[PDB]
Amino acid sequence: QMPSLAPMLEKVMPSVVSINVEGSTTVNTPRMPRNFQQFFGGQQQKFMALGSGVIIDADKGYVVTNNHVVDNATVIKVQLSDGRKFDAKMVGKDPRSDIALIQIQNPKNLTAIKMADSDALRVGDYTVAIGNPFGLGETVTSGIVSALGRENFIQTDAAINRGNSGGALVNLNGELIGINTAILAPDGGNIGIGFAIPSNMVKNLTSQMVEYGQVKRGELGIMGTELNSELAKAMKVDAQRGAFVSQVLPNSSAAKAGIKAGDVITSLNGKPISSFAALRAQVGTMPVGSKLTLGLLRDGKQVNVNLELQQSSQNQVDSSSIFNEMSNKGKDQGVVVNNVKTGTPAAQIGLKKGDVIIGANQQAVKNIAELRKVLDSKPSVLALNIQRGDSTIYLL
Amino acid sequence: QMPSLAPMLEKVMPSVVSINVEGSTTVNTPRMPRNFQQFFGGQQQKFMALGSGVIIDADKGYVVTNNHVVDNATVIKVQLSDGRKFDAKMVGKDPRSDIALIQIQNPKNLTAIKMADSDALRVGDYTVAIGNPFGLGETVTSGIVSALGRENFIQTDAAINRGNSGGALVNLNGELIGINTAILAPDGGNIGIGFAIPSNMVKNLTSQMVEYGQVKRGELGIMGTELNSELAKAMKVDAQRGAFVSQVLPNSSAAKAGIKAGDVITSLNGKPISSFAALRAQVGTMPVGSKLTLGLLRDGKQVNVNLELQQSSQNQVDSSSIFNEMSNKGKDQGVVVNNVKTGTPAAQIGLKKGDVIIGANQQAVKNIAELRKVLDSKPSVLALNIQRGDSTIYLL
Amino acid sequence: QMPSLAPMLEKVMPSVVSINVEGSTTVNTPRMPRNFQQFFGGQQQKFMALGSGVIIDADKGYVVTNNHVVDNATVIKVQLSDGRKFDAKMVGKDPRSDIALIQIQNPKNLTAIKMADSDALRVGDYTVAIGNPFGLGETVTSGIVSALGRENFIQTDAAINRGNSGGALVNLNGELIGINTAILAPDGGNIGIGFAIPSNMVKNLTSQMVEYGQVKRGELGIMGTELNSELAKAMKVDAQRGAFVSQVLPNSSAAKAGIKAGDVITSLNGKPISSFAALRAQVGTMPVGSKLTLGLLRDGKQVNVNLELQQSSQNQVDSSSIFNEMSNKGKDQGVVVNNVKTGTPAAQIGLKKGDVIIGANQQAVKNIAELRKVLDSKPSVLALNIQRGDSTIYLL
Amino acid sequence: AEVYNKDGNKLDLYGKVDGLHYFSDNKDVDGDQTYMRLGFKGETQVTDQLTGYGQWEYQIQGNSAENENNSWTRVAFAGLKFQDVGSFDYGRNYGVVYDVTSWTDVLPEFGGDTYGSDNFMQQRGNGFATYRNTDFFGLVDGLNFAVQYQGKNGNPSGEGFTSGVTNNGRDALRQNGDGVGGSITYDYEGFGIGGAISSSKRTDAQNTAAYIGNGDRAETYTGGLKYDANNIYLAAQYTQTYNATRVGSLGWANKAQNFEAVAQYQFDFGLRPSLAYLQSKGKNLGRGYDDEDILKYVDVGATYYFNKNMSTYVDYKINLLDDNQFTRDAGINTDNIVALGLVYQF
């Protein structure tokens, strides 16, 4: 009869799930009355998000999805394409790539998609996207590979006018080639065409979340922008062709090793650095503990140093199956906890600002994958062998 | 050589027509001067509309189209794809589905599309839309079946960025699978993807207009909305999870049988009613004279009753081939006329607010299809055997 | 395995180039301060443009592109798909069609696309567009022939949501079928679907630029609009159904021969003229020196006359390989120079407002193609045998 | 800043950048409100008695992305001044009613909003011909008066209007027919007393069923009082209007009674706290609205002056309007707003 994508879609759909997130966040307190002819310029607020995800491990119930959907989640629900409902928990997330991993709680008879090799993609190749555009459900749209970046973001015309960046990008064989994302951050929604992380990168970032707790991406800990910013002018910067250092992050390697706002990096390991962009991307091709010597500019300053795990990708209330923001520290040198909060449920448990945890409630916790591997096997007695540098206490 | 949709399009185009509507409406009288820095807050006004339609009966010259195009028409013109021009008259319309039927006056050598079976549609299936996007003519665009609702609105990516909801949705065999619509009422234009009524529903709604004068859809005659509305708050509604009754329609079954604004329906024939939506859709799966008992909420009130034909789908100046708003009454119990107007051309003929017409100017008029079947055969002498309940007069 | 457009795209891409234009223009001088709650109502300003082009002559390095990209260029750069960079110079442009021709300076090993026959296009035919949507590079998108005008602008759904009107439109065989354009002038960006000039017209307009210096399109030299304009009302025009003459252009044939603002043309060579539109398009189907008698309306006025080359398509600093706005004059009757500027680099060389150039620095210059053919072969000694009517001087 | 002063011509080029943020439950006003203003005032000595001048001021919003520009002209006028006789100027300028109401328009961010721009002769507007006499021929120190005419600003041109058009036409909420007004103020030592009256023809576009407050003319009557000495600033104004006060987007108030009061103190160390109250009470509004508050708020704020070129402020609009049908229909803000600003000026 007539050609159709329905035959492979039937072998694919069981792997695509819907995701309903419920969570809260801090919003500013509304000042009243409200005057709409007056252009001006803390409380938790519940919000609801919804997106798609792809079953990537049928046994473990591992579902890949966008970080812009599950971010700040308190409750994450998943509904299979056959209608069965499950609960899910955060296992990992990485805001850079806008990719996150979750785990269906109590999976039973699941189907996982097969991942194809991103590296074999070519522009005229056919593409099919599957997502939940406006909430009304699971929509599939078709097209082709528009641009192969060459980070290799995949570009495709199988998008959706005014809709939210769905999820799965699949080839004509039903294999996963990329997860569609949203490059319009803290928004969701597209620029006109579609951007996907390639399947090979998805596989890679995803395994890290599993086997470590987070992705090994080191940060230079500087924060800044281009040489056009109001501060590059309001501070008049000499020789403009590089990355403007607006501030050096606290307790960072850039901070520790030496550097101060103003200097404009001009190179990284000999190579020219013409824009924060160039730099932000280059430092992203280097895993923790790496050493990268870069040239700065004040009069003619330059240094060499080693970076540590970034702070963007971190964990929260999913390490201890219970409930309560740690992350990994250097190589397999335990799990270092970061900025504690105000509610202080975890600080209340004797955990400060820089407390490592090499003791797996008794054993070795070189990382959050392991640590969490124990706070899930023996939920009975828990004594966190934490040692924030000196103090080696054992709280419950 | 190379594949192409041109070969089937050539067998399809003769069935697609263009439609030019001319008509008027009531607009408010402009207050002058005009101050664009002052956000404020009867006369007929001519307007022009244009859309596409599909020839569905070559002999009778029956063309299906959107109700948002022909609504309020005074003059409706049709131009075939070969360029022949004709006049058309309203035969039916149904605002819910946004579907309307018209008849080419004096057809000669027409081609009708074959309708395929909507029920056999599947998501990866290929789709082709044909319409008049910006007026500039007849545009065809292609794609696939995105979502099969499952009312079964069909969702497809063969739409158009910023254009008006065209008309025909056809499969790769040139058969009609759906008529594209506009879910952005009293606007036309899409949300980002395309919504079509399925061909099987089109066939069904369309035959009703032919063989009855209108579609048999009973209304519960309540009007209201959700439990979020300003009135659900400004009136503080207890137990919020249902349909808010803002008002009970006059001379209605809800009115007649018993009900008053405020009560929030909680169920319909035992089943839960969590939103006006749910309800508006459920009452739409029930033809006139049906009986549906529903539970209300005031303190704990509930009733049972039978509904009558809705008022949205009605007729006007097309029943009497002449010129001048009736509709059907219950089963084949004549044709009941509704709200007369101000110009009073038909009221001037001895027709009040509730005047039935069982007399076909001499015969049986159980319905508008029949009635109109007579005011078209014998346009000589006309005596309307109308009886508005008691008075059984015979006007000309 | 699976079907793909990648195999023909690999035979096509080497012909598609990227184009970076740098140039300036006259902007108004900003008045400060700036009050954003105050709706109000000369200096050169540099700007940057970028677009795509198609190699159309491998030997001569001839690249076709949109006039909205190269217009006002001072510097035009081209980058092949393999990454080789070249410089380019204007050889021709035509704002009506929004089509321009350029020449790579110093081509080496180039590939040209094959042009297919536009006339054989049909609506269901498959289409593929190649362009640089948001600057980020060369994107290809696919689709079909939506509308075949029938000027034959091609309409296709292979466009891009919110992006700039790319360039090449190619069929499934990799042959050029149209150059995509922007009908949203002095903007770039689409209406929702794509508009392309057909390949056969591209071939035709393009050769003219080569063999003459510009396209032979005669103008009636009137300027005006429809009968709705504020001036058609503010001046109350009797019998409204034609083209409103707002002004007769200076030194024009309309001016010379006879005509004055107000008259509304009603016909052109016997045929009805119901809109400026109709007229602007009809006068565009007539090459210079043609004779077209049209009927005007004042009380009942009508005349006959012969038009000359339009002024929209002209040349500037590319005739003399050096640097400095001429155009062609009638048949091969030399090259007539038009409105000189303020910097006066060329006026400074003894060239007034109406100076012809039949002397090729010694030879025959019936046209800009020839003239420029000499100011490129012998860049040594240059004596412009110009004669602006009477004065036959010989400047350097 | 005076950037030119030579051979009897002076040019002052001035401006400010206000890095500004609003905090509000009302998301239509919430967020970045950064803006800049630029202007010039020039004067030329014609004779010892006669001076010519011109002034221009422009606001450019600093809170938009680069694909748009939101900017406007605040004032633009040229004039002549004769020593001990008076002055005349023409252009976009302030209406003479503002001579009195300006006295309470001294708040860090808010205030001055019982009226608006392009609002008959109440504030900034087009086509003002303004005559002023200072000190009564120099024979009564501190006594000033003004008489002003405003030409019609009507329907836009080129939009199919068949009456009431002007070259610079606009929407009806910002139109005006011909108007005339006057002001008198007297200031002795620290004290000030003042009054103003305006009367403008209303255009046909303004008097349609689409707008509340239909009427032949817009009239305003204003009284004001001021005290400004010993580091204390006190002022109050009361205005009665007829078919002149906008009611959001609905049109105008048949009658309105407007009141504004402010109290401010200047500490030696640079802090200037401010307290104010504003209200606008509309009467006989039509469409069943009857009597309604158009505006009602208490404003508490403070500015810190680092010097004459740098300052920072917080202003807190405590909005006493309640969310009701009327304010919803008119689109009037009923939420509180906190503004925080940091201002460089020259």
GROMACS .gro file of C-alpha atoms in nm, chain B residues 89-344:
model
  256
  485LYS     CA    1  -2.587   2.854  -0.053
  486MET     CA    2  -2.567   2.741   0.309
  487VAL     CA    3  -2.708   2.396   0.369
  488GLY     CA    4  -2.556   2.338   0.717
  489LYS     CA    5  -2.300   2.437   0.982
  490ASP     CA    6  -2.182   2.326   1.328
  491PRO     CA    7  -1.960   2.567   1.529
  492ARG     CA    8  -1.847   2.298   1.775
  493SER     CA    9  -1.665   2.097   1.509
  494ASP     CA   10  -1.604   2.412   1.304
  495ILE     CA   11  -1.744   2.221   1.003
  496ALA     CA   12  -1.997   2.352   0.744
  497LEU     CA   13  -2.173   2.227   0.431
  498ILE     CA   14  -2.258   2.426   0.123
  499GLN     CA   15  -2.408   2.363  -0.217
  500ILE     CA   16  -2.286   2.494  -0.543
  501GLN     CA   17  -2.581   2.653  -0.723
  502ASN     CA   18  -2.607   2.497  -1.073
  503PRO     CA   19  -2.321   2.248  -1.072
  504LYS     CA   20  -2.197   2.117  -1.404
  505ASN     CA   21  -1.921   1.852  -1.445
  506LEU     CA   22  -1.783   1.832  -1.095
  507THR     CA   23  -1.538   1.597  -0.928
  508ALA     CA   24  -1.574   1.467  -0.576
  509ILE     CA   25  -1.302   1.337  -0.353
  510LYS     CA   26  -1.321   0.987  -0.218
  511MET     CA   27  -1.342   0.979   0.165
  512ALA     CA   28  -1.111   0.731   0.339
  513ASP     CA   29  -1.181   0.557   0.669
  514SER     CA   30  -1.053   0.779   0.951
  515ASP     CA   31  -1.053   0.485   1.188
  516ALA     CA   32  -0.762   0.323   1.009
  517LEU     CA   33  -0.523   0.614   1.074
  518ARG     CA   34  -0.191   0.564   1.253
  519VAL     CA   35   0.070   0.811   1.368
  520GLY     CA   36   0.358   0.752   1.134
  521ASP     CA   37   0.112   0.781   0.843
  522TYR     CA   38   0.183   1.034   0.567
  523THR     CA   39  -0.031   1.339   0.531
  524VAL     CA   40  -0.091   1.619   0.279
  525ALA     CA   41  -0.286   1.942   0.345
  526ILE     CA   42  -0.440   2.167   0.085
  527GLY     CA   43  -0.560   2.517   0.162
  528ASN     CA   44  -0.548   2.892   0.093
  529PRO     CA   45  -0.298   3.016   0.359
  530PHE     CA   46  -0.276   3.388   0.289
  531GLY     CA   47  -0.535   3.441   0.017
  532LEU     CA   48  -0.276   3.431  -0.256
  533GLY     CA   49  -0.428   3.095  -0.373
  534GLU     CA   50  -0.423   2.710  -0.329
  535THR     CA   51  -0.115   2.586  -0.141
  536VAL     CA   52  -0.034   2.224  -0.064
  537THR     CA   53   0.199   2.125   0.219
  538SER     CA   54   0.304   1.775   0.333
  539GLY     CA   55   0.388   1.581   0.650
  540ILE     CA   56   0.255   1.305   0.880
  541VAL     CA   57  -0.009   1.208   1.138
  542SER     CA   58   0.123   1.349   1.465
  543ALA     CA   59  -0.133   1.254   1.724
  544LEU     CA   60  -0.453   1.064   1.687
  545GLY     CA   61  -0.641   1.225   1.975
  546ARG     CA   62  -0.795   0.899   2.095
  547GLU     CA   63  -1.288   1.385   2.037
  548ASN     CA   64  -1.048   1.229   1.785
  549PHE     CA   65  -0.913   1.559   1.652
  550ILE     CA   66  -0.627   1.460   1.417
  551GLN     CA   67  -0.296   1.632   1.481
  552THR     CA   68  -0.052   1.682   1.197
  553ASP     CA   69   0.264   1.877   1.125
  554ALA     CA   70   0.144   1.959   0.773
  555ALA     CA   71   0.029   2.305   0.879
  556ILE     CA   72   0.159   2.657   0.801
  557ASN     CA   73   0.348   2.917   1.012
  558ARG     CA   74   0.111   3.210   1.085
  559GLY     CA   75  -0.146   3.105   0.823
  560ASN     CA   76  -0.521   3.044   0.841
  561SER     CA   77  -0.644   2.689   0.912
  562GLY     CA   78  -0.687   2.563   0.560
  563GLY     CA   79  -0.909   2.276   0.468
  564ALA     CA   80  -0.840   1.933   0.324
  565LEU     CA   81  -0.621   1.673   0.480
  566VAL     CA   82  -0.555   1.389   0.239
  567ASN     CA   83  -0.356   1.065   0.255
  568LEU     CA   84  -0.101   0.943  -0.002
  569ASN     CA   85  -0.381   0.789  -0.200
  570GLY     CA   86  -0.564   1.116  -0.252
  571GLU     CA   87  -0.845   1.019  -0.016
  572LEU     CA   88  -0.994   1.263   0.234
  573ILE     CA   89  -0.886   1.184   0.592
  574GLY     CA   90  -0.980   1.502   0.771
  575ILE     CA   91  -1.080   1.865   0.724
  576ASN     CA   92  -0.828   2.103   0.885
  577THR     CA   93  -0.971   2.341   1.140
  578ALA     CA   94  -0.902   2.639   1.356
  579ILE     CA   95  -0.897   2.590   1.736
  580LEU     CA   96  -0.844   2.959   1.788
  581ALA     CA   97  -1.183   3.074   1.763
  582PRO     CA   98  -1.321   3.375   1.624
  583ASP     CA   99  -0.973   3.397   1.483
  584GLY     CA  100  -0.856   3.128   1.237
  585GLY     CA  101  -0.479   3.066   1.244
  586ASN     CA  102  -0.289   2.789   1.424
  587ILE     CA  103  -0.122   2.714   1.756
  588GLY     CA  104   0.188   2.568   1.589
  589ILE     CA  105   0.065   2.233   1.457
  590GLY     CA  106  -0.250   2.127   1.270
  591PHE     CA  107  -0.587   2.004   1.398
  592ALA     CA  108  -0.829   1.821   1.172
  593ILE     CA  109  -1.172   1.674   1.214
  594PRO     CA  110  -1.145   1.311   1.103
  595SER     CA  111  -1.301   1.215   0.775
  596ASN     CA  112  -1.542   0.969   0.939
  597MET     CA  113  -1.678   1.242   1.167
  598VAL     CA  114  -1.698   1.479   0.868
  599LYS     CA  115  -1.907   1.225   0.680
  600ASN     CA  116  -2.135   1.183   0.981
  601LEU     CA  117  -2.189   1.551   1.070
  602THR     CA  118  -2.228   1.632   0.706
  603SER     CA  119  -2.509   1.382   0.635
  604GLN     CA  120  -2.701   1.518   0.927
  605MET     CA  121  -2.699   1.868   0.784
  606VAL     CA  122  -2.832   1.718   0.459
  607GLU     CA  123  -3.105   1.485   0.593
  608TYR     CA  124  -3.229   1.703   0.883
  609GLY     CA  125  -3.125   2.061   0.831
  610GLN     CA  126  -2.886   2.052   1.125
  611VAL     CA  127  -2.688   1.814   1.343
  612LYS     CA  128  -2.867   1.630   1.617
  613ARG     CA  129  -2.666   1.745   1.919
  614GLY     CA  130  -2.854   1.797   2.243
  615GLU     CA  131  -2.749   2.063   2.491
  616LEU     CA  132  -2.790   2.061   2.866
  617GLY     CA  133  -2.843   2.432   2.825
  618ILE     CA  134  -2.628   2.534   3.120
  619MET     CA  135  -2.348   2.777   3.059
  620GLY     CA  136  -2.053   2.815   3.291
  621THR     CA  137  -1.687   2.725   3.333
  622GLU     CA  138  -1.418   2.598   3.570
  623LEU     CA  139  -1.371   2.646   3.943
  624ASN     CA  140  -1.091   2.897   3.891
  625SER     CA  141  -1.301   3.173   3.733
  626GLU     CA  142  -1.335   3.503   3.920
  627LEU     CA  143  -1.699   3.410   3.991
  628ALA     CA  144  -1.609   3.078   4.155
  629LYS     CA  145  -1.390   3.280   4.393
  630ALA     CA  146  -1.601   3.596   4.417
  631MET     CA  147  -1.879   3.358   4.524
  632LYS     CA  148  -1.658   3.116   4.716
  633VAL     CA  149  -1.745   2.762   4.603
  634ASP     CA  150  -1.716   2.470   4.848
  635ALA     CA  151  -1.557   2.145   4.729
  636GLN     CA  152  -1.394   2.250   4.401
  637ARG     CA  153  -1.356   1.969   4.147
  638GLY     CA  154  -1.626   1.994   3.882
  639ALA     CA  155  -1.818   2.222   3.648
  640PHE     CA  156  -1.925   2.563   3.777
  641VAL     CA  157  -2.278   2.663   3.678
  642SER     CA  158  -2.262   3.037   3.604
  643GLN     CA  159  -2.616   3.040   3.465
  644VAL     CA  160  -2.896   2.806   3.357
  645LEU     CA  161  -3.017   2.887   3.003
  646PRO     CA  162  -3.373   3.017   2.953
  647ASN     CA  163  -3.647   2.786   2.820
  648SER     CA  164  -3.392   2.503   2.861
  649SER     CA  165  -3.422   2.150   2.997
  650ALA     CA  166  -3.176   2.235   3.273
  651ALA     CA  167  -3.400   2.531   3.345
  652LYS     CA  168  -3.731   2.345   3.297
  653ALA     CA  169  -3.632   2.031   3.486
  654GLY     CA  170  -3.456   2.214   3.769
  655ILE     CA  171  -3.113   2.365   3.839
  656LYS     CA  172  -2.971   2.702   3.938
  657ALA     CA  173  -2.638   2.883   3.904
  658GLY     CA  174  -2.380   2.789   4.163
  659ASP     CA  175  -2.430   2.413   4.189
  660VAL     CA  176  -2.120   2.237   4.066
  661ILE     CA  177  -2.199   1.921   3.872
  662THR     CA  178  -1.994   1.636   4.011
  663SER     CA  179  -2.108   1.348   3.790
  664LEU     CA  180  -2.308   1.255   3.478
  665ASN     CA  181  -2.485   0.917   3.488
  666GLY     CA  182  -2.274   0.802   3.781
  667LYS     CA  183  -1.942   0.905   3.624
  668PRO     CA  184  -1.722   1.183   3.779
  669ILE     CA  185  -1.728   1.531   3.623
  670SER     CA  186  -1.409   1.714   3.714
  671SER     CA  187  -1.430   2.003   3.465
  672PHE     CA  188  -1.674   2.196   3.247
  673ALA     CA  189  -1.451   2.056   2.971
  674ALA     CA  190  -1.515   1.693   3.061
  675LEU     CA  191  -1.889   1.776   3.073
  676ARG     CA  192  -1.917   1.986   2.756
  677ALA     CA  193  -1.753   1.694   2.572
  678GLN     CA  194  -1.970   1.424   2.739
  679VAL     CA  195  -2.296   1.600   2.661
  680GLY     CA  196  -2.170   1.609   2.303
  681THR     CA  197  -2.187   1.228   2.281
  682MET     CA  198  -2.564   1.236   2.318
  683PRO     CA  199  -2.828   1.309   2.047
  684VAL     CA  200  -3.150   1.501   2.124
  685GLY     CA  201  -3.425   1.364   2.344
  686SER     CA  202  -3.169   1.157   2.535
  687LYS     CA  203  -3.198   1.129   2.914
  688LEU     CA  204  -2.897   1.193   3.137
  689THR     CA  205  -2.915   1.207   3.518
  690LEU     CA  206  -2.639   1.412   3.685
  691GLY     CA  207  -2.532   1.496   4.040
  692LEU     CA  208  -2.518   1.860   4.148
  693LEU     CA  209  -2.368   2.019   4.455
  694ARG     CA  210  -2.521   2.288   4.679
  695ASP     CA  211  -2.537   2.085   5.000
  696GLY     CA  212  -2.599   1.761   4.810
  697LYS     CA  213  -2.852   1.806   4.523
  698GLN     CA  214  -2.903   1.572   4.223
  699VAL     CA  215  -3.152   1.535   3.934
  700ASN     CA  216  -3.244   1.343   3.614
  701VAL     CA  217  -3.364   1.501   3.283
  702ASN     CA  218  -3.395   1.495   2.901
  703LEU     CA  219  -3.218   1.748   2.669
  704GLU     CA  220  -3.321   1.912   2.338
  705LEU     CA  221  -3.138   2.027   2.024
  706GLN     CA  222  -2.858   2.275   2.092
  707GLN     CA  223  -2.886   2.632   1.974
  708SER     CA  224  -2.539   2.676   1.830
  709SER     CA  225  -2.612   2.493   1.506
  710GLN     CA  226  -2.912   2.671   1.349
  711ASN     CA  227  -3.044   2.791   1.014
  712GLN     CA  228  -3.141   3.137   0.883
  713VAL     CA  229  -3.226   3.262   0.534
  714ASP     CA  230  -3.161   2.932   0.356
  715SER     CA  231  -3.474   2.738   0.452
  716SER     CA  232  -3.701   2.942   0.225
  717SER     CA  233  -3.506   2.981  -0.101
  718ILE     CA  234  -3.623   3.341  -0.071
  719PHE     CA  235  -3.452   3.539   0.210
  720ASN     CA  236  -3.513   3.670   0.562
  721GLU     CA  237  -3.335   3.150   1.257
  722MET     CA  238  -3.517   2.821   1.309
  723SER     CA  239  -3.382   2.479   1.403
  724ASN     CA  240  -3.525   2.136   1.470
  725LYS     CA  241  -3.754   2.050   1.760
  726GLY     CA  242  -3.720   1.717   1.938
  727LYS     CA  243  -3.766   1.410   1.719
  728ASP     CA  244  -3.946   1.449   1.388
  729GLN     CA  245  -4.189   1.685   1.557
  730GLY     CA  246  -4.174   1.967   1.306
  731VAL     CA  247  -3.940   2.264   1.286
  732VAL     CA  248  -3.942   2.505   1.580
  733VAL     CA  249  -3.842   2.868   1.511
  734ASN     CA  250  -3.625   3.051   1.764
  735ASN     CA  251  -3.526   3.411   1.852
  736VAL     CA  252  -3.667   3.644   1.585
  737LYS     CA  253  -3.478   3.965   1.501
  738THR     CA  254  -3.529   4.342   1.468
  739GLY     CA  255  -3.555   4.386   1.091
  740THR     CA  256  -3.842   4.140   1.139
   0.00000   0.00000   0.00000
